[PDB]
Design brief:
Glutaredoxin; 4 strands; alpha+beta; 108 residues; 47% helix; cell redox homeostasis; Thioredoxin fold; Glutathione Binding; four-stranded mixed β-sheet; monomeric; oxidoreductase; globular
Length: 108
């Protein structure tokens, strides 16, 4: 499907991806957590607002990750969680480990 191809190619083509929408406290937390460590140029955020294929994309996210809700966060093409997991990983140090292993965060 168009949605499957869009999602698959976005996560394969970009090292850090977050699917998001405006009305989403966990999306805000997720983007903030990533931006704590990464320049915006290294974060690929796909917002569903204003799209006409939002439901199709979320349906495919259900197939791929086990849930429809945003946010859905991927590192190196792999699902790492939905809100508010990204914030937890940020706060317990594990997100930085993941980002370093993926080569988008240097040791400081």
């Amino acid at each position: 499907s168009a949605a499957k191809q869009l999602v698959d190619s976005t996560i394969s083509g970009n090292k850090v991806v977050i699917f998001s929408k405006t009305y989403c406290p966990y999306c805000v937390k997720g983007k903030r957590a990533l931006e704590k460590f990464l320049p915006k140029s290294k974060i690929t955020a796909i917002e569903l607002d204003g799209r006409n294929d939002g439901a199709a994309i979320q349906d495919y996210l259900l197939e791929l990750t086990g849930g429809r809700s945003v946010p859905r966060v991927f590192i190196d093409g792999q699902f790492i969680g939905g809100g508010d997991d990204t914030d937890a990983l940020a706060r317990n140090g594990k997100l930085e480990v993941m980002l370093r292993n993926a080569g988008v965060l240097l040791e400081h």
